[PDB]
Amino acid sequence: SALTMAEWFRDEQGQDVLLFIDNIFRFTQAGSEVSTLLGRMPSAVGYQPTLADEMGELQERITSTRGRSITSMQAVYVPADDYTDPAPATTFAHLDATTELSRAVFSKGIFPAVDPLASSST
Amino acid sequence: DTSGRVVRVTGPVVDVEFPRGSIPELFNALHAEITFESLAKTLTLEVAQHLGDNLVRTISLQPTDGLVRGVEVIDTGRSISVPVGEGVKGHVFNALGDCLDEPGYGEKFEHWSIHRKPPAFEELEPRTEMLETGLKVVDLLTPYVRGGKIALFGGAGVGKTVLIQEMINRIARNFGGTSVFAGVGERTREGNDLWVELAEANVLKDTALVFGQMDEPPGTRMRVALSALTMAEWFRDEQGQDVLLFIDNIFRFTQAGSEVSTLLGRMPSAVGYQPTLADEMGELQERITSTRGRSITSMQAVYVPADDYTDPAPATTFAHLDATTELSRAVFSKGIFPAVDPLASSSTILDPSVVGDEHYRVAQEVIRILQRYKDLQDIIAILGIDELSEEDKQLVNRARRIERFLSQNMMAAEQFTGQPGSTVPVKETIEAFDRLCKGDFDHVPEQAFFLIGGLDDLAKKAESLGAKL
Amino acid sequence: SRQRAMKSATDNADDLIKALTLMANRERQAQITQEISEIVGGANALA
Amino acid sequence: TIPADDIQSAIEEYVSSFTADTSREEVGTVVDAGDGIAHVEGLPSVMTQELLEFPGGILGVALNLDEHSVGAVILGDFENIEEGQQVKRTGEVLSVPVGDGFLGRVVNPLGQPIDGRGDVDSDTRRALELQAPSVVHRQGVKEPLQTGIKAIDAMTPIGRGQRQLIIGDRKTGKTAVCVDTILNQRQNWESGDPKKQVRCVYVAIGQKGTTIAAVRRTLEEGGAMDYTTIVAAAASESAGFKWLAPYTGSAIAQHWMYEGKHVLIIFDDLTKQAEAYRAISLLLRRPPGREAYPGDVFYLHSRLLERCAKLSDDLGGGSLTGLPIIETKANDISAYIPTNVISITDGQCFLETDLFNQGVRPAINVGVSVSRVGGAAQIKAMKEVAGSLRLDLSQYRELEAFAAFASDLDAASKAQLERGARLVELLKQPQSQPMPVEEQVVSIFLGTGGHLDSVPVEDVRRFETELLDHMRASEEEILTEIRDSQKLTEEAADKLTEVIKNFKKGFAATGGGSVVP
Amino acid sequence: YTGSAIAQHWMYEGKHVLIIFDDLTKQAEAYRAISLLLRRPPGREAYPGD
Ligand SMILES: Nc1ncnc2c1ncn2[C@@H]1O[C@H](COP(=O)(O)OP(=O)(O)OP(=O)(O)O)[C@@H](O)[C@H]1O
Numbered sequence A: 001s002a003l004t005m006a007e008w009f010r011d012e013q014g015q016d017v018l019l020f021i022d023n024i025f026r027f028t029q030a031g032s033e034v035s036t037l038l039g040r041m042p043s044a045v046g047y048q049p050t051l052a053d054e055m056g057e058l059q060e061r062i063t064s065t066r067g068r069s070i071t072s073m074q075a076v077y078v079p080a081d082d083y084t085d086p087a088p089a090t091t092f093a094h095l096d097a098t099t100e101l102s103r104a105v106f107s108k109g110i111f112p113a114v115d116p117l118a119s120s121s122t
Numbered sequence B: 001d002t003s004g005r006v007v008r009v010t011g012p013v014v015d016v017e018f019p020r021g022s023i024p025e026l027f028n029a030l031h032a033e034i035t036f037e038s039l040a041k042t043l044t045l046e047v048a049q050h051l052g053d054n055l056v057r058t059i060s061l062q063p064t065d066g067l068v069r070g071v072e073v074i075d076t077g078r079s080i081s082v083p084v085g086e087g088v089k090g091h092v093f094n095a096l097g098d099c100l101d102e103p104g105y106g107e108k109f110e111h112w113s114i115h116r117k118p119p120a121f122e123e124l125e126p127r128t129e130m131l132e133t134g135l136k137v138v139d140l141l142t143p144y145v146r147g148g149k150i151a152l153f154g155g156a157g158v159g160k161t162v163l164i165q166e167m168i169n170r171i172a173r174n175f176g177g178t179s180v181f182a183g184v185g186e187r188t189r190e191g192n193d194l195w196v197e198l199a200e201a202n203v204l205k206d207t208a209l210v211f212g213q214m215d216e217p218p219g220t221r222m223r224v225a226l227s228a229l230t231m232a233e234w235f236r237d238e239q240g241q242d243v244l245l246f247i248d249n250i251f252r253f254t255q256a257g258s259e260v261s262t263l264l265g266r267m268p269s270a271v272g273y274q275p276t277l278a279d280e281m282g283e284l285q286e287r288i289t290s291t292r293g294r295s296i297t298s299m300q301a302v303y304v305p306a307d308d309y310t311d312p313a314p315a316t317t318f319a320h321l322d323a324t325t326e327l328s329r330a331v332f333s334k335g336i337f338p339a340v341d342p343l344a345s346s347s348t349i350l351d352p353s354v355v356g357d358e359h360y361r362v363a364q365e366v367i368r369i370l371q372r373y374k375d376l377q378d379i380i381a382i383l384g385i386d387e388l389s390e391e392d393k394q395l396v397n398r399a400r401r402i403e404r405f406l407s408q409n410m411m412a413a414e415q416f417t418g419q420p421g422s423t424v425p426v427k428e429t430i431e432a433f434d435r436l437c438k439g440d441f442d443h444v445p446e447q448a449f450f451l452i453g454g455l456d457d458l459a460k461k462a463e464s465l466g467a468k469l
Numbered sequence C: 001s002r003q004r005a006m007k008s009a010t011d012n013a014d015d016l017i018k019a020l021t022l023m024a025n026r027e028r029q030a031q032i033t034q035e036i037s038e039i040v041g042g043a044n045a046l047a
Numbered sequence D: 001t002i003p004a005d006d007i008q009s010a011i012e013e014y015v016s017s018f019t020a021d022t023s024r025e026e027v028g029t030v031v032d033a034g035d036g037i038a039h040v041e042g043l044p045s046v047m048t049q050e051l052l053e054f055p056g057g058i059l060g061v062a063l064n065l066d067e068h069s070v071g072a073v074i075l076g077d078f079e080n081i082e083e084g085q086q087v088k089r090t091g092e093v094l095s096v097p098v099g100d101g102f103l104g105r106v107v108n109p110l111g112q113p114i115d116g117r118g119d120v121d122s123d124t125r126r127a128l129e130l131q132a133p134s135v136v137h138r139q140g141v142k143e144p145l146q147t148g149i150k151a152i153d154a155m156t157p158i159g160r161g162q163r164q165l166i167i168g169d170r171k172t173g174k175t176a177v178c179v180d181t182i183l184n185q186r187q188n189w190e191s192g193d194p195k196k197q198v199r200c201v202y203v204a205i206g207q208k209g210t211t212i213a214a215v216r217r218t219l220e221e222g223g224a225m226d227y228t229t230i231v232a233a234a235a236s237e238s239a240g241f242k243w244l245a246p247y248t249g250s251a252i253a254q255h256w257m258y259e260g261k262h263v264l265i266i267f268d269d270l271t272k273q274a275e276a277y278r279a280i281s282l283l284l285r286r287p288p289g290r291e292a293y294p295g296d297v298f299y300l301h302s303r304l305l306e307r308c309a310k311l312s313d314d315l316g317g318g319s320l321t322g323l324p325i326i327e328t329k330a331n332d333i334s335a336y337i338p339t340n341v342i343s344i345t346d347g348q349c350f351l352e353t354d355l356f357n358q359g360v361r362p363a364i365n366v367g368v369s370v371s372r373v374g375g376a377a378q379i380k381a382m383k384e385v386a387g388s389l390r391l392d393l394s395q396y397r398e399l400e401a402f403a404a405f406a407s408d409l410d411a412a413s414k415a416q417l418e419r420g421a422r423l424v425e426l427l428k429q430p431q432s433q434p435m436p437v438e439e440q441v442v443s444i445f446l447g448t449g450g451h452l453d454s455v456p457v458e459d460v461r462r463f464e465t466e467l468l469d470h471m472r473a474s475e476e477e478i479l480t481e482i483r484d485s486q487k488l489t490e491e492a493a494d495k496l497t498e499v500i501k502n503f504k505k506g507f508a509a510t511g512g513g514s515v516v517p
Numbered sequence E: 001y002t003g004s005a006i007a008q009h010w011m012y013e014g015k016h017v018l019i020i021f022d023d024l025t026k027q028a029e030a031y032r033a034i035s036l037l038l039r040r041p042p043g044r045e046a047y048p049g050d
């Protein structure tokens, strides 16, 4: 819904959209909560078999076209501080700059708790 | 009339329906036809389960792309049969017995079913016996078992194919036997490489190659070991000939079994392998044995997943292995061929009750000296050589002599050097290394010990290098 | 004294490496088995 | 101006000749549909992997066949599938157009251009599942494929016909390695020699669209789009597209390989193809195995990677070099798909984040990286000047614990320490700057001949850079005869040594000191 | 949920309530038991999807 509002602002009005998304991971989690009820065999870590493709159908709309800009910014929950979990591991491939916060840096009192050795930018 | 027809096709798994009185045996080989001219072929299905209602579930040994429901399926009345005889020497086959270098060759040979039973209990040999190869390091520190299994842990660029050629030559000349090479999950590049290398070394006329390659469904990668084993079993039982069977990456046989089990809908065991992992490895390895005075010895490359020797696949494979040969790269960079790591290899018949007390004593002394030299090697490499003591130097020089004398002029090097290989009797090896540890050769220069046979070759080398005593 | 202490310390560190590797491989196998159990449990629940 | 009546009369050409007589077709009906899979009742003659035509130009692939229905994977626009629609049969298994018109284009995993530069003139069609060359249809891998990267080209050489895996965690520089391998074939393409030209296929599976756009921009700014095709299955495409993309990219470039040409193909993130196939197989309710993979995923990758071959001379002598990319998690090369692809390929390049952060870029772990082809995939000059390199770095890596106690080390040990530091600084390399094999020979000559022991370790790179610059301007004859004769004979080594000494007495370090022995 | 309802009745009258859910883990175990006895497909650790 919010992405559709942003897409209208980008395609029809055409002026410098900003799009914040607090915990885009909840999208994947909600998709996994109904997956077996829909009758799908679960994949590796209990996620829906269609994890990457649903995430790609949603994330590829959060984009800027030629001449039309959408500065997108998403918070991504990492389950149990595990960056190898399939949901953040799949979200990683959709981003130009990823600021990765760490609980080892949070425990030291350093804020923002950014892990400088894992965070990246293109 | 008495023929079936396809009902379900889901990947390599094909269900076939037969008339009521024509349900095929388990493991029977059925023949379906793909007529789409781009992919036209003859699928060989292998019956795996009886599903009831005249349905059977089979695993296709070729890819099922282009298969139509309802096509006629002909029953052959037997399991996968491979051609046997001496005419299978010098040629390359696949898991089904089709000649790859000369298609159509072997169609007129006798054919043997790849599903056989191991020798009966009253026909097994109760006493183990050492296979005297003629190599000094193998005969002394890692005595191979005749009719036993040998793991081979050689990586890349450590002369593993040269050791394969060497064992081929030795079994073909010292024992008047033959060799069968099972490439389980064999890369086609390395398969062609091995083919042309054996053809150039002129040991193809002594070997039968059976390749189940990597671009094939798990059925053939699972059955190629049994195909090669059936050829070897003909050579041992019917021809009366000692055989040497090379199963490269037995782990790929295990993995193909796991994949076939997952395809057939069976519930996975611990870690993930098939519930019948031990039974499959057993039915394979129990046929490689000694029978009525003839033998099948096996050299098997093993892959250890995540270097976990407690992993179910290597923990199951090692229950059947009798010796271990680890080819080291450090030993290969020293010019010591064969590059067998002496401290890291091992054998289960290096026991006084089998080889003798003197053999055991000499082997243990050599291993002690080499291990102490391995201890001193790092302090030598960081601090320098005569930072050490002079007892330490005496040991280091003796150990260099011993470590270099374990190399040999292998029969595989004759094609490059012209001089024939050596075959050192085990008694002469024991005598030579006893004298080496006693110190009877601490003055002869080190280069006199590289790639020689017995004691007389060492003496001749020392004379052509200006020393003796 | 320092040479001997560091020899024994590197031996203890080697044995600790060995024990930790054994436990880590044990867990690795356990995690694969438990994940397979969950996957197959769901797949059977659906059938 | 624009060709106006050319347009209108082109389409009148199309319609006037519109002939579609009433043929008899065998149809089925969709009985259910969900998550990208459709079950179709009927179609008694449909074969496995056959293309099916749904209403609206939608395409599917008949994967599951049983007595009730046919389970088909919808190849896009799945939300237009309804229960009760009519499914027509094609009679053809998946095939793609192949030809030379595919150079410089970006296509679907179906041969359809997605860059919008018009249609692609196709020579022929080619089925996706044509068998790999026989075990006797091949030839020993003997010619080198230069990546332009010193670490790879010296330590883990790649031949023509070899499968080299590029495996790494993430943001380690795998795409950069493959893009530089592609860019390095620019000068071989300029030569106009069909025995030296290398055509490139870049398969992009499951990537963001702007990422593929950036890769294409990098390949254009390097002039590498005259000989490169991109088969793009963006992250928004269906699971069937991501599963089929490398087979489309391998069907292209097999036409070339069988036409006696030399091709390089890059499968970017085979892990995403494995996950797309796992999605497909779980939606078709096939038995799951370890990590929920179908059980033929090893076959999925090995059937693809065994089509990379070096053909014999009676098949033309063409070749297809593979560079499959695998993305590990926390450097777990003991995972399922990493294990499979490590088992399949002929050598591995392990990229690591710890090396990447320490400044070692490309972050290739030369201790665990390997190439099972080896020196057969090298020229004489590089095989000579880089045979010294492996155990140099081994000694340095086992000595670097004593970096703070070089005073207590032997002479040879401190020598090995300094030489190893120099050699590690030698294999570092910027991004998108590949070097020809003669310049790599000269640089590794600097390293292993000892001509860097006088230069500070924090000055090696620049030094080497400037030296090559000098040699490209002043003494081009050394590089020229290295390129032409593939060997560095002793006289060229003499002239090279003198050039190095002169440049040394001309070179100024950053601390102000000297670099003269 | 019973405690939460008892507390919400007070909360919606302008009062301040504090509710302590001792071992929500036991509730999650009970819900897993219910869902596994109703043969609803399990997730991780055999827990229901919700
Ligand atoms: N040789 C190099 N020198 C300096 N920087 C490099 C080099 N190679 C890559 N990089 C940098 O590393 C970053 C990641 O590179 P790259 O995108 O090639 O990695 P990747 O394996 O594709 O990671 P992912 O697939 O997860 O995006 C890039 O931003 C690039 O600038």
Ligand SMILES: [Mg+2]
Residues within 6 Å of the ligand: D174, D175
């Ligand atoms: Mg990338």
